[PDB]
Amino acid sequence: GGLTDEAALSCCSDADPSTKDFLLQQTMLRVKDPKKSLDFYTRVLGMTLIQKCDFPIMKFSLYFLAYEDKNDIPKEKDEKIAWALSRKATLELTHNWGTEDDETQSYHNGNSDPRGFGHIGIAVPDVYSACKRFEELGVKFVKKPDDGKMKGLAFIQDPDGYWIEILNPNKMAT
Amino acid sequence: GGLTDEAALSCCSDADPSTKDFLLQQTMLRVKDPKKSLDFYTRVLGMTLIQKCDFPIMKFSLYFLAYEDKNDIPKEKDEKIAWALSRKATLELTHNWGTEDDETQSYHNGNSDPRGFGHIGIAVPDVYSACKRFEELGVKFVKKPDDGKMKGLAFIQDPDGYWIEILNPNKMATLMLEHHHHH
Ligand SMILES: [Zn+2]
Ligand SMILES: [Zn+2]
């Protein structure tokens, strides 16, 4: 079972010029408590809040988190949103107002039935030093770097239980 | 409800120097049928297959898709994996072998109970021209750009039913920053 290398290539088309400036801008995750999510993504993971949007009638907010230098954020609001929403590799965290006050409410991480989405993943220079710091800050682990079959690869979870892979691309050939 | 701009900013901390080389490398989605997913992501959305990994004991494959020039892909296998897994903004599609032949099997897109993940999103130069092409390619739409509350933004679905936003960054101020009427 599983596709051959040749079968996978037989399915691939080269990029049409009509797509040439397309970019993979965002992954959207719903978050129960934006106070906990903002602290985790900024203080623990080192992302920057690059844009906040509020929809007061539909009762939700969007938080765009990215690995960007805060000094690169434009000061004028229309330029800032066009900059933020043209960054590659952002996270769009959706806060449905009031979930943080609902003891019975939680989101689903995709890793138990019914499955779909699995994880986001962060590339780091050193999985072990990254994970030592995560452990010092009280991050919950799904998989410590040396636990299980694949040594030197970790999974943490965010405040909603979403899985985050921590990988060092220079060690992955092994 | 919801945080004020000041309250949200106050919940943020400046990035620790130990994180300054971290990058958001991948989003992982499980796919029923890799042939349909590869045709969709390469041909319809214009991504490149940059790495394929097979795990014969665990019976799954990984496909890494990205907006990269195929001429940048190293030929040597270990250099190629290090290159592919150091790209920002990749999609990691996980094929659990045998799903493609199981008429009763489908993955969950996160947009009905139980919710969590919602979508990925593609920034394009022109949502209307992109969507006209998508219509010509028989893409299934969730939301056309001229329907619903958020005009100028589209949602399409991939072969597993995952939602993909189609957005133009230069149209998002009017969509997201303008004063909205109460009825
Ligand atoms: Zn979105
Ligand atoms: Zn992964």
Side-chain angles (χ1 to χ4, degrees), chain A residues 23-165:
Chain A
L23 65 88
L24 182 58
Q25 200 281 313
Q26 54 176 241
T27 300
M28 187 285 255
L29 306 172
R30 297 172 181 88
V31 299
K32 179 180 175 65
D33 183 352
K35 306 182 297 300
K36 288 181 183 183
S37 298
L38 291 166
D39 176 68
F40 176 86
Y41 280 102
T42 66
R43 192 177 52 85
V44 174
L45 292 184
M47 298 188 189
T48 300
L49 174 65
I50 61 168
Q51 177 68 52
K52 172 181 179 284
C53 300
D54 301 287
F55 296 89
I57 300 157
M58 304 190 266
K59 300 173 68 180
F60 69 94
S61 300
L62 308 177
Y63 297 90
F64 290 90
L65 281 289
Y67 286 117
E68 296 285 340
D69 185 329
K70 70 185 273 186
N71 289 325
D72 290 344
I73 304 169
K75 59 175 152 160
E76 189 275 312
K77 77 187 160 180
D78 290 357
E79 192 163 6
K80 173 173 161 181
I81 194 159
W83 176 85
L85 271 285
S86 60
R87 297 310 88 190
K88 289 171 53 167
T90 78
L91 290 186
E92 179 184 354
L93 304 181
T94 298
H95 175 219
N96 289 307
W97 300 351
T99 50
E100 62 270 43
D101 304 315
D102 183 346
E103 278 167 306
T104 72
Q105 186 283 332
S106 67
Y107 292 117
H108 181 67
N109 70 6
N111 293 301
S112 63
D113 294 340
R115 296 195 305 170
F117 166 84
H119 56 261
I120 57 171
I122 296 178
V124 305
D126 178 347
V127 169
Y128 294 92
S129 61
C131 287
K132 176 168 213 220
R133 172 171 174 280
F134 296 152
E135 291 179 17
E136 290 175 339
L137 295 178
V139 172
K140 291 187 54 148
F141 283 74
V142 171
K143 178 215 185 293
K144 289 255 194 58
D146 288 334
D147 286 348
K149 254 295 295 171
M150 307 196 214
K151 303 295 186 218
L153 182 58
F155 288 84
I156 64 175
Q157 62 184 63
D158 85 350
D160 285 89
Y162 295 115
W163 290 18
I164 306 177
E165 185 177 319

